């Protein structure tokens, strides 16, 4: 059995998008089909359902109005016609089979799932990264500094420190999808709390797509 989603890309809120799920390795015409979404990095959220025939159709309240799950048994494809997309509909949509078993629709058990196509709804063009200094406070004998790479878009950002001359003590966290349809991540360096005043520290952020190369000297306060 194989489920292969399709038609997953970036979209502006309000506009439309229809995901396609090429199903194979089974009948499809005799199993109900589900759609499930998993926003990074939250849990599984049950989206919509369509019966084996296409009669019964059910959605979540967070989706009730604006989505219309359909399906094409001729092509063995499930369709999630998503209209009027919003921000918190951004998720990894999952084509999921239903397990209708044991004789005399249908039921809620998903034996097989698809790879899942990521939909990133965002009213946003390529935004350059705004970088902010995470000036230390410190929990002896160690202190922490960093750079909040925020309000950037899209997503490949590369951060370094001291132009490559600082690999150890460093930890760059994953990017998060913000409440502005942009992104945010932080870069951190863990150093001796005694070395603060002397050593200069620069986060060398580099958003390649938008062509921005931000550099922020991080130091403590007063």
């Amino acid at each position: 059995v194989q489920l292969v989603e399709s038609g997953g890309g970036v979209v502006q809120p309000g506009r439309s998008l229809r995901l396609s799920c090429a199903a194979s390795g089974f009948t499809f015409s005799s199993y109900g089909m589900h759609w499930v979404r998993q926003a990074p990095g939250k849990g599984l959220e049950w989206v919509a359902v369509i019966s084996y025939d296409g009669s019964n159709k059910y959605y979540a309240d967070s989706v009730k109005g604006r989505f219309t799950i359909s399906r094409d048994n001729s092509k063995n494809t499930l369709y999630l016609q998503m209209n009027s997309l919003r921000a918190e509909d951004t998720a990894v949509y999952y084509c999921a089979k239903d397990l209708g078993e044991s004789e005399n629709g249908v039921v809620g058990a998903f034996d097989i799932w698809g790879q899942g196509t990521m939909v990133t709804v965002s009213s946003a063009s390529t935004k350059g990264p705004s970088v902010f200094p995470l000036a230390p406070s410190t929990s002896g004998g160690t202190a922490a500094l960093g750079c909040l790479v925020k309000d950037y878009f899209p997503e490949p950002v590369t951060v370094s420190w001291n132009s490559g001359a600082l690999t150890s003590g460093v930890h760059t966290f994953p990017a998060v999808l913000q409440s502005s349809g942009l992104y945010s991540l932080s870069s951190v360096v863990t150093v001796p709390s005694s070395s603060l005043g002397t050593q200069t520290y620069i986060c060398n952020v580099n958003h390649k797509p938008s062509n921005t190369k931000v550099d922020k000297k991080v130091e403590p306060k007063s």
């Binding site: 589900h34 849990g43 599984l44 059910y58 058990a109 799932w113 929990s139 309000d151």
Partner: protein, 210 residues
């Protein structure tokens, strides 16, 4: 419409782990329960259906049960390949999933989280924006429940938190942000980062007066 399962359960290799699903009769009681595994960067996988029944291909060391308003998934002989997000689900006449239970086959002692919270920079306030960055480090297993608190009052807004990732010391690390208006920031004596880990709860705090 919220099925209750703990964020984390964790045993040693070879041991039993059980994951519970408590809720209400309308959700779990009168209905079938189904358990799903999810390795990181993979689609969910069906483990258990109809409370206790099992598919062919699933190792026999995956058990299921339902006693009224409670349902249990067990795992004997724990092996690293069991490290995953386990979700419980159900139907009702689709239905609802669990909060998400992580499983970690302990390869080391529980390390408690080192919390380093950063306030919004004066440079960030010079753009009429503000973000508090809580940075939780060196912890194991990789399951933390971050709550923010304006003064002792709670706060729901601006919260974005990452799914933990293993560092180079094999212990996990994550981060939570708090997107605030500079007025709100300057309108509370202190914001705080409550970090719950394996039952323990750590609180770091900052104030605009710093």
């Amino acid at each position: 419409s919220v099925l209750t399962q703990p964020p984390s359960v964790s045993a040693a290799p070879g041991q039993k782990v059980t994951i519970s699903c408590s809720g209400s009769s309308s959700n779990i009681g009168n209905n079938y329960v189904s358990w799903y595994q999810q390795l990181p960067g993979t689609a969910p996988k069906l483990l258990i259906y109809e409370n206790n029944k099992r598919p062919s291909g699933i190792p026999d060391r995956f058990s299921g049960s339902k006693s009224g308003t409670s349902a249990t998934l067990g795992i004997t002989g724990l092996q690293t390949g069991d490290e995953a997000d386990y979700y419980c689900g159900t139907w009702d006449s689709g239905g609802v999933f669990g909060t998400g239970t992580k499983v970690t086959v302990l390869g080391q002692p529980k390390a408690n989280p080192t919390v380093t919270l950063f306030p919004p920079s004066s440079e960030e306030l010079q753009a009429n924006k503000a973000t508090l960055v809580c940075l939780i480090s060196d912890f194991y297993p990789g399951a933390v429940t971050v709550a923010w608190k304006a003064d002792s009052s709670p706060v729901k807004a601006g919260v974005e938190t990452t799914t933990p990732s293993k560092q180079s010391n094999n212990k996990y690390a994550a981060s939570s942000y708090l997107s605030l208006t500079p007025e709100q920031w300057k309108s509370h004596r202190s914001y705080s980062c409550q970090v719950t880990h394996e039952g323990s709860t750590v609180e770091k705090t900052v104030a605009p007066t710093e």
